[PDB]
Structures are given as C-alpha cells and as structure tokens.
Design a protein around this ligand. Structure first.
Ligand SMILES: O=C(Cc1cccc(Cl)c1)Nc1cnccc1C(F)(F)F
Ligand SMILES: [Cl-]
Lengths: 298, 301
C-alpha cells in the first residue's frame, strides 16, 4: 500500500553528469561514450557564428575531479555535442527518445555537474514542465528506465516567467514553441492530462479509496464536452484502450470512471481527499500506476 | 523557481542493494563493507510472526542457510549476528561500491528518501517524512522489506530507516540501521495500530516560507500571535505543538523573507480557520508538512 510520486533510481544517470564551462557560463553536460551533450546556450544569438569562434580548449569539461579534454565539437539543433578523448566507463545502455505531452519522466537536477536531487514530472500539454530548478541547473536531464536501458527524453534549457521550465529532447529539438534566447516567451494556457487523472483514480481504487465511485456511466462524446469545459485534455479511444488493464483489475469500466471524474469536476471533493490530495492529480500515467501497483524493478 | 518533493540521487544506495533469502522468505539487504544488514524477520516463517523467538530461530541457522545475491553474484555468508531487529550478515566480499556513510537515528518531522526495492533490485525513489506517530506514509508492496531510507549530505549517505512492515492502515513501520524500531512497534504480526497522526507544524511553516520565497504571499495577514495561543489553536486541528526549538530553527527563513515566525504562525492559524478558498500554495490545495526547514533552505536557495 501507499502511492507516492516516484522517480526512477537515478544511479545510471548520475554516472553521466559532468560540468561544462565556456567563458563565464557553467552548466551541466551528459557524458555518454566519448560525447558530452549540453545546451548550446553555454557558448552565449547566431549560434553558428558564436561556435565557429570557439576552439576545443575553450570548453572546460569536468567529470568529478577529473578534467576531460575536448577534441571536437558540433551542434545538433539546440544541443552542443562535445567530443571528448575519454569514453565514459559508466555509460549505461541508453536511447534518446522524444516524449509526448502527458508522458512522465524523472529529472536528475544538477548544479556544477553534481546531482542534487531527483523528482518525477510530466511533460505538460503546453510542453512545459513544472520542475524545480535554480541557476546552474541547465543541462539537467529527464529520463525513464525500461529494464536496463535509460531513455533520455529531456534536457533543461530555461525557465519561463511563470516559474515553469522549457527544454529539448537529447537531439536538441525543443518541446513547445520555445527558442533558446532571452526574449518574450510565455507558456501557453495549460490543460489537465485527463488519461493521467483517470489512471490516478484507478490507483486510488486499488489503494481502497472508493467514495468517488458512482453507478453511472457516460459516452466518450458527453465526457469530452464536460472535460473541454474544465480545461481537461480530450480523452481519445487510445486513452480508453490504454486504461483497459486498470479497468479489468478494478472492475470499473473506463467510461464508468469518466462518470466519477465528471461528478468531481462538477461538484468538487466536498472536503474529502483522494490519495491524500484535495486536487485531481495528473502526473501519473496509466503505466506509472501499473508499475507502482506491481513493483517493477531496474 | 518551482518547488518539488525532491528525493536525493539514489545511485550511492543502489550500489548497496542485495537480495537476502532465508528458506522461503526473500527480502532486501544493505551491503556496506563486508556486512549485509537486513530485517531479522527474514528468518521467520508466516506461522512464526505471531510470537517469534528470534534468538531461538537464529541459533538454529548456519551461515549457508542465508543466500545473499548482489546482482548475478552470490555472496558467501561467513558470520551472522543480531543487533536489535536487524540481522547483520558477515560476507566474504567487501562492497567495492560502498559509499561514505553514517547510521543516523532521525526524529519525527525529519524527511528522507526511500529507495524502494524488490529482490535486491531498486524500482523507485521517493521522498518521505517520519510522521509524529513514528510511521511513514510510504509506497511499498510485498518483498519491499529491507528497503532503506537515507539522506545525502555532500558525499556521505546517512542511512536512517530500514523498512520492516506495513500496518493495517496502509502506513509503514521500520527501524534505524541499528535495528531499533521507530515508535512502539514490534516485528510481530500482533495487533498493532499507528497512533493518531498529527501535522508537522514546523514543516508546514517552512513550506509557507518556501511559498513566500517563490512569490506567493496571499495567505499572510497583519496579525501576530504568542507561541501559547498558536499552540492552543494548532492542537484543535491535530497539529503538533510548535516549540521554541522550532521557532529558533525557522530563524534563517524568517530573516530571509522578513516575516517573523509568530507572524507566519498567525497566517497558519488563519489558513486553518479559512481553508484556501479555491487557491493553492506552491501548487497544493492542502498544507504540506513533508518539507523541513533544512529542505526548504536546500531547494529554494
Ligand atoms: O508487512 C509485511 C511483512 C510483515 C508482516 C508482519 C510483521 C512484519 Cl515485521 C512483517 N510486508 C509488507 C511490507 N511493506 C508493504 C507491504 C507488505 C505486505 F504485507 F503487503 F506484504
Ligand atoms: Cl532528525
């Protein structure tokens, strides 16, 4: 029993964190094999022009108390790839994956190439992450672990004026309509990840919280009209299919749980909580609920 | 900006997790140097848990009855001893991944990270707090026993908790790494219940200071309170008494934000009275009590 916001064990990623310095800018880099990946704003904009003026020795890369020597550099989208002489002996089995909004991942927040914390978060529908980052956190990475393989899905680049964060996948493509530069940028109006709220309601039923259940059902269309009214993301047939296992385990059909969600949106919680929360939680995917309510290890 | 429930990076602890098997029971062990620490109930059967005599069960065991597995390598047990509710298995190999560590016993209100493990394999990491009733609201399934709680201070891992059992309300009980249980719990399947839980007041105040640091001031008011009046009000909401020690501990946050501790206490009193009125504080519709004054200073600054 118990339901916590759980991150993946960060050890495989900790062994990859390095500090990258260029001029007066210090941020984090991800050292995988003989390449260090970091935000291209470390050189700061005309990034081709700024980069051409740099020599290999202008980039100081530090792995613990060991200085790595940069032997090459190239830019791929908004990510700088520093070719180093030494391959990381701690390189885990890894993939670079691009995630979709609603998907969750763990973030190993780092400062000066030293990991300081790990937390779980979701890529919001507005492509921002509600993270916890301070100055020097740039280059901190987001990941999932699938068996023994680390799938790197996010690299921190910046903080928006509302306190939310923006970044890229490990191929340097931003999530969201953001650019890497000091300019007027704002996160779009955010929405609630409906499939994730439903997954969390199934997690509550599994942990013995059933007060929100009712005898009612709904059509997908009627639920989607109600959900659009409350800034909830549309629920697709794919989401319904994905919630199939949880529906079979608890005995509550997805559209039956949708009817519970409609009642909570229309009437609130009435002084009650669900899994110790007075708000509907949307940062647990159906897979996170299954993994935590089954004990999958890495 | 941002305020998340953040766990310590678990890597230093992952390299210590092993699987300990005794007969039909499999749970987790913590391999530090040449010793594997695990709950002593690993030697118990299910029909032993009611009134187990651990000294009698342990004397009947030899080293080869304990199977210890670190990854795909079987460690050889060369000795065993019991210290309170933990079994210490002497092994023939020192853990090369042994970090710099300490065994620390924590007080209620303290937070720590939990590396939840099954079969000596880490599955997740989350942040926890020792509740005033000495239980932890964790997330553990069967096979999680032996999973550990820790804090990392610089390069040193302070092990503060080892999971032993789940109580009937879904909460968890365990020991420090010297085998002393937190609270009035025993490693017996006897009728045990967590005492009435209370809110960690000093932690809620710390989290209100974290909200002020991140720009949320809507809950502040023009009032102050005496420490006694605050405690009279707090006790009616099942909040832990706030001591002069807690007030002293909140000094740095009070100096940083410019809001006196008893002035923040007055906002808390008002929040308890009014609720949040559809508003949130740091993305929460409830008053958060699992961030200490030390956690707030570490994460906000
Ligand atoms: O409580 C237990 C085993 C147990 C029983 C009675 C007394 C002791 Cl000291 C230990 N396991 C457990 C732990 N943590 C979470 C769940 C579980 C579960 F029960 F489900 F297996
Ligand atoms: Cl303590």
């Amino acid at each position: 029993s118990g339901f916590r916001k759980m991150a993946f064990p960060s050890g495989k990623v900790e062994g990859c964190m390095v500090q990258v310095t260029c001029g007066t800018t210090t941020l984090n880099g991800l050292w995988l094999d003989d390449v260090v990946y970091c935000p291209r704003h470390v050189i700061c904009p005309n990034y081709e022009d700024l980069l051409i003026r740099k020599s290999n020795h202008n980039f100081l890369v530090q792995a613990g108390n060991v200085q790595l020597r940069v032997i090459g550099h190239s830019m791929q989208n908004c990510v700088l790839k520093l070719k180093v002489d030494t391959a990381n002996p701690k390189t885990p089995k890894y993939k670079f994956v691009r995630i979709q909004p609603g998907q969750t991942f763990s973030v190993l927040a780092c400062y000066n190439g030293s990991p300081s914390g790990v937390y779980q978060c979701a890529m919001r529908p507005n492509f921002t992450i509600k993270g916890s980052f301070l100055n020097g956190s740039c280059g901190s990475v987001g990941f999932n672990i699938d068996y023994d393989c680390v799938s790197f899905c996010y690299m921190h680049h910046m903080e928006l004026p509302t306190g939310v964060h923006a970044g890229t996948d490990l191929e340097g493509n931003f999530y969201g309509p953001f650019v890497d530069r000091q300019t007027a940028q704002a996160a779009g109006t955010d929405t609630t990840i409906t499939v994730n709220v439903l997954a969390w309601l199934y997690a509550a039923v599994i942990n013995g919280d059933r007060w929100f259940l009712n005898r009612f059902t709904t059509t997908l269309n009627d639920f989607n009209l109600v959900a659009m009214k409350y800034n909830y993301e549309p629920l697709t047939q794919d989401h319904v299919d994905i919630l199939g296992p949880l529906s079979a385990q608890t005995g509550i059909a997805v559209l039956d749980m949708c009817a519970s969600l409609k009642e909570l949106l229309q009437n609130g919680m009435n002084g009650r909580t669900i899994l110790g929360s007075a708000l509907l939680e949307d940062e647990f995917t159906p897979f996170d609920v299954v993994r935590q309510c089954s004990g999958v290890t890495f």
